Short mmCIF file of all heavy atoms in Angstrom, two decimals:
data_model
loop_
_atom_site.label_atom_id
_atom_site.label_comp_id
_atom_site.label_asym_id
_atom_site.label_seq_id
_atom_site.Cartn_x
_atom_site.Cartn_y
_atom_site.Cartn_z
N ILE X 11 -99.49 -26.88 -70.49
CA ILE X 11 -98.70 -27.85 -69.75
C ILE X 11 -97.26 -27.36 -69.73
O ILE X 11 -96.71 -27.02 -70.78
CB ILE X 11 -98.80 -29.25 -70.38
CG1 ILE X 11 -100.06 -29.95 -69.89
CG2 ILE X 11 -97.58 -30.10 -70.02
CD1 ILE X 11 -100.59 -30.99 -70.85
N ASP X 12 -96.66 -27.34 -68.55
CA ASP X 12 -95.29 -26.87 -68.42
C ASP X 12 -94.33 -27.83 -69.11
O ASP X 12 -94.54 -29.05 -69.14
CB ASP X 12 -94.90 -26.73 -66.95
CG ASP X 12 -95.19 -27.99 -66.15
OD1 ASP X 12 -95.74 -28.95 -66.72
OD2 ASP X 12 -94.86 -28.01 -64.94
N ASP X 13 -93.26 -27.27 -69.66
CA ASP X 13 -92.18 -28.07 -70.23
C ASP X 13 -91.17 -28.43 -69.15
O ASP X 13 -90.95 -27.67 -68.20
CB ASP X 13 -91.48 -27.31 -71.36
CG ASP X 13 -92.38 -27.05 -72.54
OD1 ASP X 13 -93.36 -27.81 -72.72
OD2 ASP X 13 -92.11 -26.10 -73.30
N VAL X 14 -90.57 -29.60 -69.29
CA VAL X 14 -89.62 -30.13 -68.32
C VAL X 14 -88.21 -29.95 -68.88
O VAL X 14 -87.93 -30.34 -70.02
CB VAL X 14 -89.90 -31.61 -68.01
CG1 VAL X 14 -88.73 -32.24 -67.26
CG2 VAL X 14 -91.19 -31.74 -67.22
N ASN X 15 -87.33 -29.36 -68.08
CA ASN X 15 -85.93 -29.16 -68.43
C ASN X 15 -85.08 -30.12 -67.62
O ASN X 15 -85.23 -30.21 -66.40
CB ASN X 15 -85.49 -27.72 -68.17
CG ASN X 15 -85.87 -26.78 -69.29
OD1 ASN X 15 -87.01 -26.33 -69.38
ND2 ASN X 15 -84.92 -26.49 -70.16
N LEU X 16 -84.18 -30.84 -68.30
CA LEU X 16 -83.26 -31.76 -67.65
C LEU X 16 -81.89 -31.64 -68.29
O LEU X 16 -81.77 -31.57 -69.51
CB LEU X 16 -83.75 -33.21 -67.73
CG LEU X 16 -85.12 -33.50 -67.10
CD1 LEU X 16 -85.60 -34.89 -67.50
CD2 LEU X 16 -85.05 -33.37 -65.59
N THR X 17 -80.86 -31.63 -67.45
CA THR X 17 -79.48 -31.67 -67.90
C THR X 17 -78.77 -32.81 -67.18
O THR X 17 -78.84 -32.90 -65.95
CB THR X 17 -78.76 -30.34 -67.62
OG1 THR X 17 -79.45 -29.28 -68.29
CG2 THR X 17 -77.32 -30.40 -68.11
N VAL X 18 -78.11 -33.67 -67.94
CA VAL X 18 -77.45 -34.85 -67.41
C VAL X 18 -76.08 -34.98 -68.06
O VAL X 18 -75.76 -34.30 -69.03
CB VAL X 18 -78.27 -36.14 -67.63
CG1 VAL X 18 -79.56 -36.11 -66.80
CG2 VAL X 18 -78.58 -36.34 -69.11
N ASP X 19 -75.26 -35.87 -67.50
CA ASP X 19 -73.94 -36.14 -68.04
C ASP X 19 -74.06 -37.16 -69.18
O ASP X 19 -75.15 -37.61 -69.54
CB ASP X 19 -73.01 -36.64 -66.94
CG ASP X 19 -71.63 -36.03 -67.03
OD1 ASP X 19 -70.98 -36.18 -68.08
OD2 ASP X 19 -71.20 -35.39 -66.05
N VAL X 20 -72.92 -37.53 -69.76
CA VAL X 20 -72.93 -38.48 -70.87
C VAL X 20 -73.28 -39.86 -70.35
O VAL X 20 -72.81 -40.29 -69.29
CB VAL X 20 -71.58 -38.48 -71.60
CG1 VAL X 20 -71.71 -39.20 -72.93
CG2 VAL X 20 -71.08 -37.05 -71.82
N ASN X 21 -74.12 -40.57 -71.11
CA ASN X 21 -74.59 -41.90 -70.73
C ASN X 21 -75.34 -41.88 -69.40
O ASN X 21 -75.27 -42.82 -68.62
CB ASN X 21 -73.43 -42.90 -70.65
CG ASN X 21 -72.55 -42.87 -71.88
OD1 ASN X 21 -73.05 -42.90 -73.01
ND2 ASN X 21 -71.24 -42.81 -71.68
N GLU X 22 -76.07 -40.79 -69.15
CA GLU X 22 -76.91 -40.65 -67.97
C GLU X 22 -78.37 -40.60 -68.41
O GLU X 22 -78.75 -39.72 -69.18
CB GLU X 22 -76.55 -39.40 -67.17
CG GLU X 22 -75.20 -39.46 -66.49
CD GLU X 22 -75.11 -38.52 -65.30
OE1 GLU X 22 -75.90 -37.55 -65.25
OE2 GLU X 22 -74.25 -38.74 -64.42
N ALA X 23 -79.17 -41.53 -67.91
CA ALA X 23 -80.56 -41.62 -68.33
C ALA X 23 -81.38 -40.54 -67.64
O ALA X 23 -81.43 -40.52 -66.40
CB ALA X 23 -81.13 -42.99 -67.99
N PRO X 24 -82.02 -39.63 -68.37
CA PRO X 24 -82.87 -38.63 -67.70
C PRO X 24 -84.05 -39.29 -67.01
O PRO X 24 -84.58 -40.30 -67.47
CB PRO X 24 -83.32 -37.72 -68.85
CG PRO X 24 -83.23 -38.57 -70.06
CD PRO X 24 -82.05 -39.45 -69.84
N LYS X 25 -84.45 -38.70 -65.88
CA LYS X 25 -85.56 -39.22 -65.08
C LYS X 25 -86.79 -38.38 -65.37
O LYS X 25 -86.98 -37.31 -64.78
CB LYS X 25 -85.20 -39.20 -63.59
CG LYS X 25 -86.10 -40.08 -62.74
CD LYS X 25 -85.75 -39.96 -61.26
CE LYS X 25 -86.90 -40.42 -60.38
NZ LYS X 25 -86.62 -40.22 -58.93
N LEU X 26 -87.63 -38.86 -66.27
CA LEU X 26 -88.83 -38.13 -66.66
C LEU X 26 -89.89 -38.27 -65.58
O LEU X 26 -90.10 -39.37 -65.07
CB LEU X 26 -89.36 -38.66 -67.98
CG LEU X 26 -88.97 -37.83 -69.21
CD1 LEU X 26 -87.46 -37.62 -69.25
CD2 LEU X 26 -89.43 -38.52 -70.47
N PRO X 27 -90.57 -37.19 -65.18
CA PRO X 27 -91.53 -37.31 -64.07
C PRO X 27 -92.64 -38.30 -64.38
O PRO X 27 -93.08 -38.42 -65.52
CB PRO X 27 -92.07 -35.88 -63.91
CG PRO X 27 -91.07 -35.01 -64.56
CD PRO X 27 -90.49 -35.80 -65.67
N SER X 28 -93.08 -39.00 -63.34
CA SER X 28 -94.23 -39.90 -63.49
C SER X 28 -95.53 -39.12 -63.58
O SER X 28 -96.50 -39.60 -64.18
CB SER X 28 -94.28 -40.88 -62.32
OG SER X 28 -95.37 -41.77 -62.45
N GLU X 29 -95.58 -37.93 -62.98
CA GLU X 29 -96.74 -37.06 -63.04
C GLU X 29 -96.27 -35.65 -63.35
O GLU X 29 -95.12 -35.28 -63.07
CB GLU X 29 -97.53 -37.08 -61.73
CG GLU X 29 -98.11 -38.45 -61.39
CD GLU X 29 -99.00 -38.43 -60.16
OE1 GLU X 29 -98.66 -37.72 -59.19
OE2 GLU X 29 -100.04 -39.12 -60.17
N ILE X 30 -97.16 -34.85 -63.94
CA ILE X 30 -96.83 -33.54 -64.45
C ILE X 30 -97.85 -32.53 -63.94
O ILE X 30 -98.95 -32.88 -63.52
CB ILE X 30 -96.78 -33.53 -66.00
CG1 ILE X 30 -96.05 -32.29 -66.55
CG2 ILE X 30 -98.19 -33.58 -66.58
CD1 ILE X 30 -94.64 -32.11 -66.04
N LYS X 31 -97.45 -31.26 -63.98
CA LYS X 31 -98.34 -30.15 -63.65
C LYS X 31 -99.13 -29.75 -64.89
O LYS X 31 -98.54 -29.53 -65.95
CB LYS X 31 -97.55 -28.96 -63.12
CG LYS X 31 -96.77 -29.23 -61.84
CD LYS X 31 -97.70 -29.65 -60.71
CE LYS X 31 -97.38 -28.92 -59.42
NZ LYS X 31 -97.68 -27.47 -59.50
N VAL X 32 -100.44 -29.66 -64.75
CA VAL X 32 -101.33 -29.21 -65.83
C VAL X 32 -102.02 -27.95 -65.34
O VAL X 32 -102.72 -27.98 -64.32
CB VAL X 32 -102.35 -30.30 -66.21
CG1 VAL X 32 -103.63 -29.69 -66.77
CG2 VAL X 32 -101.74 -31.28 -67.19
N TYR X 33 -101.82 -26.85 -66.06
CA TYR X 33 -102.41 -25.57 -65.69
C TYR X 33 -103.66 -25.32 -66.51
O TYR X 33 -103.62 -25.31 -67.75
CB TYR X 33 -101.41 -24.43 -65.91
CG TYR X 33 -100.14 -24.56 -65.13
CD1 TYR X 33 -99.07 -25.28 -65.62
CD2 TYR X 33 -100.01 -23.98 -63.88
CE1 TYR X 33 -97.90 -25.41 -64.91
CE2 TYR X 33 -98.85 -24.10 -63.16
CZ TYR X 33 -97.80 -24.82 -63.67
OH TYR X 33 -96.63 -24.94 -62.95
N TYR X 34 -104.78 -25.10 -65.82
CA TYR X 34 -106.03 -24.74 -66.45
C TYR X 34 -106.16 -23.22 -66.52
O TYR X 34 -105.44 -22.48 -65.86
CB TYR X 34 -107.22 -25.30 -65.68
CG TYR X 34 -107.30 -26.81 -65.63
CD1 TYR X 34 -106.43 -27.54 -64.84
CD2 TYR X 34 -108.27 -27.49 -66.35
CE1 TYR X 34 -106.51 -28.91 -64.77
CE2 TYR X 34 -108.35 -28.87 -66.29
CZ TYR X 34 -107.46 -29.58 -65.50
OH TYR X 34 -107.54 -30.95 -65.44
N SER X 35 -107.11 -22.77 -67.34
CA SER X 35 -107.71 -21.48 -67.06
C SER X 35 -108.36 -21.55 -65.68
O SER X 35 -108.57 -22.63 -65.13
CB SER X 35 -108.75 -21.12 -68.11
OG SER X 35 -108.12 -20.67 -69.30
N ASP X 36 -108.64 -20.39 -65.11
CA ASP X 36 -109.08 -20.19 -63.72
C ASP X 36 -107.88 -20.30 -62.78
O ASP X 36 -108.02 -20.00 -61.59
CB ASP X 36 -110.21 -21.16 -63.32
CG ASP X 36 -110.57 -21.09 -61.85
OD1 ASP X 36 -109.85 -21.70 -61.03
OD2 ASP X 36 -111.59 -20.46 -61.52
N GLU X 37 -106.70 -20.66 -63.27
CA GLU X 37 -105.46 -20.51 -62.51
C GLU X 37 -105.46 -21.40 -61.26
O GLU X 37 -105.42 -20.92 -60.13
CB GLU X 37 -105.25 -19.04 -62.14
CG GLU X 37 -103.86 -18.70 -61.64
CD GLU X 37 -103.83 -17.34 -60.97
OE1 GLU X 37 -104.69 -16.50 -61.30
OE2 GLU X 37 -102.94 -17.10 -60.12
N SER X 38 -105.50 -22.71 -61.49
CA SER X 38 -105.55 -23.66 -60.39
C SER X 38 -105.16 -25.04 -60.90
O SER X 38 -104.75 -25.21 -62.06
CB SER X 38 -106.93 -23.68 -59.75
OG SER X 38 -107.92 -23.99 -60.71
N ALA X 39 -105.26 -26.03 -60.01
CA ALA X 39 -105.15 -27.45 -60.35
C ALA X 39 -103.75 -27.85 -60.77
O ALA X 39 -102.94 -27.00 -61.16
CB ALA X 39 -106.16 -27.82 -61.44
N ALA X 40 -103.46 -29.15 -60.70
CA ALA X 40 -102.11 -29.66 -60.92
C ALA X 40 -102.05 -31.18 -60.83
O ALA X 40 -103.08 -31.83 -60.58
CB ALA X 40 -101.15 -29.02 -59.91
N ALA X 41 -100.86 -31.75 -61.02
CA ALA X 41 -100.56 -33.14 -60.67
C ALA X 41 -101.45 -34.13 -61.44
O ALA X 41 -102.28 -34.84 -60.88
CB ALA X 41 -100.71 -33.35 -59.15
#
């Protein structure tokens, strides 16, 4: 599963994705 990088200012709430990319073997699929 990919890691999410976020940079925000002070007192700024990061917006975490509602859905994420999941990588399988066989090199496909997502969301």
Side-chain angles (χ1 to χ4, degrees):
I11 277 154
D12 52 357
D13 295 336
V14 167
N15 278 81
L16 301 169
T17 301
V18 293
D19 223 302
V20 193
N21 310 312
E22 291 203 338
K25 197 183 160 184
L26 261 52
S28 181
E29 298 185 321
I30 196 57
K31 298 300 226 67
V32 152
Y33 301 87
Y34 296 73
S35 283
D36 173 279
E37 193 195 335
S38 57

